[PDB]
Design a binder for this molecule. Structure first.
Ligand SMILES: *[C@@H]1O[C@H](CO)[C@@H](O[C@@H]2O[C@H](CO)[C@@H](O)[C@H](O)[C@H]2NC(C)=O)[C@H](O)[C@H]1NC(C)=O
Ligand SMILES: *[C@@H]1O[C@H](CO)[C@@H](O[C@@H]2O[C@H](CO)[C@@H](O)[C@H](O)[C@H]2NC(C)=O)[C@H](O)[C@H]1NC(C)=O
Ligand SMILES: *[C@@H]1O[C@H](CO)[C@@H](O)[C@H](O)[C@H]1NC(C)=O
Lengths: 50, 33, 33
């Protein structure tokens, strides 16, 4: 149903913002969203300090 | 927390959520001699 | 083996197949001054 489909997407979004990318790999870990973004910048190639 | 794991950048203003702390210099005992 | 591009972690028994040699240190020349 559209209801639990939107619920699945909500779970995806919540895990992405809060738990980082780990929930699809291991167990969800609380971790700051800003630090998650800094880690992603480190991923692309720019140092997180920016 | 040694300087080997850190790179200083900017100052203590732009950062948000920073905390005060000490960072060990791995040279001080080696600087004493 | 410069200590710049090498790092330490732990002791010399947990590891497996380790060998014996002094790691070179770059801080010896200028410390002699
Ligand atoms: C980190 O330490 C510095 C030390 O200078 C703090 O800056 C001052 O700390 C004194 C403490 O007596 C306060 O009275 C001042 O108001 C602070 N600001 C200035 C401009 O002098 C700084 O606040 C500390 N920061 C944190 C996050 O602990
Ligand atoms: C590297 O040297 C150390 C020190 O000799 C060896 O560890 C043992 O150390 C004790 C106490 O110093 C000695 O009584 C033993 O004889 C040492 N063992 C051996 C086999 O010499 C360590 O084993 C050496 N490692 C290698 C790869 O030679
Ligand atoms: C490694 O191989 C050598 C030669 O086959 C053998 O003597 C030794 O026991 C092996 N293991 C270690 C930890 O050196």
């Amino acid at each position: 149903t559209d209801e639990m489909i939107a619920q699945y997407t909500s779970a995806l979004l919540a895990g992405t913002i809060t738990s980082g990318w780990t929930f699809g790999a291991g167990a969800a870990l609380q971790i700051p969203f800003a630090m998650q973004m800094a880690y992603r910048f480190n991923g692309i190639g720019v140092t997180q300090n920016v | 927390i040694t300087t080997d794991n850190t790179f200083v950048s900017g100052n203590c203003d732009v950062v948000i959520g920073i905390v005060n702390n000490t960072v060990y210099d791995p040279l001080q005992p080696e600087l004493d001699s």
